Design a binder for this molecule. Structure first.
Ligand SMILES: O=P(O)(O)O[C@H]1[C@H](OP(=O)(O)O)[C@@H](OP(=O)(O)O)[C@H](OP(=O)(O)O)[C@@H](OP(=O)(O)O)[C@H]1OP(=O)(O)O
Lengths: 604, 32, 53, 45, 230, 114
């Protein structure tokens, strides 16, 4: 098939489609005249074409006419003296024809014109080094460095003197280089040199210069702390290698005294002391270092409550005087911004709970603890949105601890008022049960069932409540109310379960007749289900009178099945009669059930 | 980018009566 | 263990040959676990006071 | 890094480049349309 | 032994031979001084073995008197130094998580340590740390953290590796009851790879739709399969 | 298991024997260093009164070597670019073009998609 890509390939192939020799000077002149006219025409119309300038100069080089080539390069430099390739090409053209002095004059002009272009200095340097003009290279580096260049030029000068094995020259260069570039990597380059190319007297003297310098010039804040720290650590480790551990120890002590604000220096002393020191001094420094580490992690991320827990452990373990302050930071720093019980709030509340428990145990400051509860409940927890049930239950337990039980019930009622909660109600119920003021617990239960009316869980509790109180009549009334029409918010299965619980409770009280009445009511609620009839038969059996009651219940089940006009109901009734015969009857009733069995149904 | 529905999305006045019923309860004996 | 302690245990076993010649659901479950004993102590103190009342 | 310009109007060199190099929801509308549907049903009935 | 170490003639097997000699003679607290005197001398590749020995002895030995903040300091030092040199640090991360569970019981910190290991080229180890971190979070920390780990593991890992965790994320959401989130997670996972080389997700997608979907959604899954195959 | 038996000294020996975009100043220093490496593989003054100019006693062999080194490195670079151009002129997969400059332009456009 034709394609646009194919069409365009054919266009490309469709479009993609004499070597004269010069026999004498006259033909060469004609050729050169024509070429020069061409190049001059282009450069006249567009003098900014630096590439064309270079090509025209190279054309003159190929004619061996260096005077013309030089003139072309010069004219190009007149157009744009900043174009480094032009300068480099001109210098190379000069060197290729061995005109080393023209090249020198030109390289000197280049560095005089553009002294900040490193390429020109490196060109001059490499040219003189190729000619083994070591002293010229040295004078070049001396001038370059005197012009205060970047670190690259100083490093190159050091490398040059190292090539010359001129160790005193390298000392003198470093002596200037640390002034031009005070960064601590420059001093550490000098000490690194003296270690491999110098005596230990010099190495100690250069470290002492470094410290005396940062000490005297500290007021300028030239070096960052990390720089001074690396300088001191390097100096200490070097004295440790030289077996003079005492002088490294003195160095660390005096340096820490001079600059107490540098944590990195304390950590370096910890790193040193863990391998060259002793056991006793290591753990206090480790505790301080971990305090700093937790502080850094916590300031970077204030809602990292795992680290808050570890941080509080560390401070109360090693620095007992800072316990309270760090708590007052944990409360105010880690408080969430959101307005929901997400994981941050759930983990945050345990910092408050730990603060409360710590206060109560280690201080017994009831006034302060009451102040803490006031701050938490009234201010921090957004009650209109959510609340922690454990907080209010803990407040209740603490309040009862300090004999203000009426105020404990007052704050519990307040907790119910501002934000009802299932666990708040459950804990309130539990505490009031322990208080043994049982009459108040039922008034709690009514508020609970007002809060959420559908759950049978609350509905079932009055049963064993009034049973513990021994009020059979009140329990019966409560059970009747529970299954009444006013509780329509409960599901049908939940209502059946509550009715079953009430029936079991009534059976416990030996109220067989009331149990039978409730069983009939539950069968009415079960829409005369066959299982309801079976349960009624079982209840009659639990009421040889049991066998007669079972027979009467089987007859009632048969009558109910006939009333519903259901063959499946009749089969269920027959199965119930057979089961009663098998359990507490005889084979005669089983045969009767077989006679009442319908043919595959058609009852007979 | 893996965009998900928020967590919790799923596929696809009785207080007066409760108070009245509670107030109709008989007085407790406190026989315990 | 597997790299160097395993070799060194063999060394301390080879030295027996030298010795022969010598002689010849909750998102806050973890915090709950950590804080549980303090809660139990506070609960016992509450129980004692509430039994007093 | 300034991308190379490719014009959709001008092509001085007559180049060929890939086609790729050459080449509002408001509830008021729904509310209006359904109001007119309701008015239509109102009249029709 | 100390003179051998001073002469820098100590070899990694001899540095452990000394430490084991001291431990066998109940001088354990001075055993650790051997490990700290010798670990800095060797290259990081060997520092890994000596760090393993040091931390294994420090965390579990009746005579060690290192406080918990000290053992954490050792662990953080090991992980910083070795991971600064690219050495596989899986074993130290696992040991650190186990120790953090042991000493304080902060499961949340233990999981975060494992996640640090999996997030930091040893792709098989990072897949083992992602499986342990996520399984531990599922078993103990619940959805608010498990989702933030899953949606990071899937996002970071490349295709054909993250698909394993798309199936696992879908299973987690199906168990937690968010069937729709599971369905769209699996829908995201199906698009990662051609079904010719992506059968592992597709039979679990069929299983999920049979367990929790119905006829119309299952037919949508089949539409997705045939569309993806083209 | 064979590496656990090297002394600390042997580790020091082994660890010392076997341990985008560039600025013009950095490229310049690197080129200077390369030229010095190459030199390592290969390897008075008077001032007149009348003209005032200074003359240096250069070694004509070193001046010859310099001119030859510059000629040979220019040649090497030129040939490397020539080969690179032949490769570019034969590679395919780029968007359709109608002439060589159009091909180079489409390739330049392709390098922006990186
Ligand atoms: O609303 P509830 O059915 O009473 O649920 C509460 C409640 O959970 P929510 O706040 O999410 O509703 C508690 O949380 P807080 O009020 O204390 O913040 C929670 O406690 P945790 O926060 O520790 O999970 C408690 O569970 P538990 O009883 O184990 O403390 C649980 O109570 P239930 O389990 O009885 O429902």
């Amino acid at each position: 098939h034709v394609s646009a890509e194919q069409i365009l390939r054919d266009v490309y192939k469709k479009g993609q489609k004499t070597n004269i020799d010069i026999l004498d000077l006259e033909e060469l002149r004609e050729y050169q005249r024509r070429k020069r006219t061409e190049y001059e025409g282009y450069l006249k119309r567009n003098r900014l074409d630096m590439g064309q300038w270079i090509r025209y100069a190279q054309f003159e080089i190929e004619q061996h006419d260096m005077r013309r080539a030089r003139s072309i390069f010069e004219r190009a430099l007149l157009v744009d003296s900043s174009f480094i390739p032009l300068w480099i090409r001109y210098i190379d053209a000069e060197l290729k024809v061995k005109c080393i002095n023209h090249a020198r004059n030109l390289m000197n002009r280049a560095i005089s014109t553009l002294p900040r272009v490193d390429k020109l200095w490196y060109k001059y340097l490499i040219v003189e080094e190729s000619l083994n003009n070591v002293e010229i290279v040295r004078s070049l580096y001396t001038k370059w460095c005197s012009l205060e260049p970047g670190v690259n030029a100083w490093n190159s000068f050091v490398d040059f003197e190292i090539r010359q094995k001129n160790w005193n020259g390298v000392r003198e260069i470093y002596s200037k280089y640390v002034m031009a570039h005070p960064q601590m990597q420059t001093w550490l380059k000098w000490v690194r040199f003296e270690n491999r190319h110098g005596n230990t007297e010099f190495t100690r003297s250069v470290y002492s210069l470094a410290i005396d310098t940062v000490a005297n010039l500290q007021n300028l804040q030239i070096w960052s702390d990390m720089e001074v720290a690396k300088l001191v650590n390097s100096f200490a480790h070097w004295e440790a290698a030289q077996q003079e551990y005492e002088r490294s120890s003195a160095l660390y002590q005096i340096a820490i005294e001079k600059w107490p604000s540098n944590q990195l220096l304390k950590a370096g002393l910890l790193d040193f002391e863990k391998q060259f020191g002793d056991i006793n001094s290591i753990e206090e420094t480790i505790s301080y270092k971990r305090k700093m580490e937790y502080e850094t992690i916590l300031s970077n991320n204030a809602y990292d409550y795992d680290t808050w827990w570890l941080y509080l452990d560390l401070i109360s373990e090693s620095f007992p005087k800072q316990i309270m302050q760090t708590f007052e930071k944990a409360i105010v720093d880690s408080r969430p911004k959101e307005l929901s019980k997400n994981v941050q709030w759930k983990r945050y509340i345990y910092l408050w709970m730990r603060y409360i428990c710590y206060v109560e145990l280690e201080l017994e400051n009831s006034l302060l603890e009451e102040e803490l509860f006031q701050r938490l409940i009234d201010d921090i927890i957004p009650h209109k949105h959510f609340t922690f049930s454990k907080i209010w239950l803990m407040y209740a337990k603490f309040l009862i601890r300090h004999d203000d039980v009426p105020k404990a019930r007052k704050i519990l009622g307040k907790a119910i008022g501002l934000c009802p909660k299932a666990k708040t109600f459950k804990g309130y119920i539990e505490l009031e049960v322990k208080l043994k003021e049982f009459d108040r617990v039922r008034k709690i239960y009514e508020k609970f069932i007002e809060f959420q009316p559908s759950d049978l869980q609350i509905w079932s509790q009055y049963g064993e409540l009034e049973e513990n109180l021994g009020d059979w009549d009140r329990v019966r009334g409560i059970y009747t109310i529970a299954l009444d029409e006013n509780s329509d918010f409960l599901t049908k299965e939940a209502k059946i379960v509550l009715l079953q619980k009430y029936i079991t409770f009534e059976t416990e009280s030996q109220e067989f007749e009331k149990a039978r009445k409730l069983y009939r009511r539950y069968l009415e609620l079960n829409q005369y289900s066959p299982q309801s009839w079976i349960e009624f038969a079982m209840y009659q059996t639990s009421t040889d009178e049991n066998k007669l009651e079972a027979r009467k219940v089987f007859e009632e089940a048969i009558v109910f099945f006939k009333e519903k006009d259901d063959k499946q109901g009749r089969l269920s009734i027959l199965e119930a009669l057979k089961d009663y015969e098998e359990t507490y009857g005889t084979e005669l009733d089983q045969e009767t059930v077989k006679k009442r069995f319908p043919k595959v149904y058609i009852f007979p | 980018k893996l965009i998900l529905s928020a967590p919790g999305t799923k596929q696809g006045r009785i207080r007066k009566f409760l108070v009245q019923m509670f107030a109709s309860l008989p007085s407790p004996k406190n026989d315990f | 263990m597997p790299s160097l302690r395993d070799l060194s245990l063999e060394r301390d076993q080879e030295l027996n040959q030298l010795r022969a010649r010598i002689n010849q659901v909750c998102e806050t479950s973890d915090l709950k676990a950590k804080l549980a004993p303090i809660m139990e102590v506070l609960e016992k103190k509450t129980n004692e006071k509430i039994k007093g009342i | 890094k300034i991308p190379a310009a490719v014009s959709n109007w001008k092509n001085p060199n007559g180049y060929t480049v890939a086609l790729e190099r050459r080449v509002t929801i408001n509830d008021g509308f729904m509310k209006l349309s359904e109001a007119l549907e309701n008015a239509d049903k109102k009249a029709r009935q | 032994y100390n003179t051998v170490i001073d002469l820098r003639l100590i070899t990694p097997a001899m540095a452990e031979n000394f430490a084991l000699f001291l431990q066998n003679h109940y001088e354990v607290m001075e055993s650790f001084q051997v490990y700290e005197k010798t670990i800095p001398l060797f290259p990081p590749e060997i520092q890994y073995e000596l760090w393993i020995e040091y931390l294994e002895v420090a965390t579990s030995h009746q005579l060690s008197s290192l406080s918990p903040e000290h053992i954490r300091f050792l662990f953080e030092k090991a992980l910083k130094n070795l991971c600064s040199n690219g050495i596989d640090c899986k074993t130290i991360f696992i040991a650190y998580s186990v120790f953090e569970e042991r000493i304080s019981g902060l499961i949340s910190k233990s999981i975060e340590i494992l996640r640090r290991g999996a997030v930091i080229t040893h792709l098989e180890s990072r897949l083992q740390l992602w499986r342990m971190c996520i399984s531990k979070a599922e078993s103990t920390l619940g959805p608010s953290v498990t989702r933030e780990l899953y949606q990071e593991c899937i996002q970071i890992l490349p295709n054909s590796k993250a698909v394993e965790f798309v199936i696992k994320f879908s299973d987690f959401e199906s168990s937690i009851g968010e069937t729709i989130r599971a369905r769209e997670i699996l829908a995201y996972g199906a698009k990662l790879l051609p079904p010719s080389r992506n059968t592992e997700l597709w039979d679990s997608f069929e299983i999920f739709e049979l367990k929790h979907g119905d006829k119309e959604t299952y037919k949508d899954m089949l539409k997705m399969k045939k569309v993806l195959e083209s | 298991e064979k590496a656990f038996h090297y002394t600390v000294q042997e580790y020091d020996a082994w660890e010392r024997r076997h341990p985008g975009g560039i600025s013009y100043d950095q490229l310049a220093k690197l080129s200077y260093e390369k030229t010095l490496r190459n030199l390592a593989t290969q390897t008075k003054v008077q001032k007149d009164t009348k003209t005032g100019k200074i003359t240096i006693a250069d070694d004509d062999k070193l001046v010859n070597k310099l001119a030859v080194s510059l000629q040979s490195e220019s040649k090497k670079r030129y040939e490397a670019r020539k080969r690179q151009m032949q490769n570019a002129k034969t590679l395919y997969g780029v968007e359709s073009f109608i002439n060589d400059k159009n091909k180079q332009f489409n390739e330049k456009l392709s390098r922006e998609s990186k």
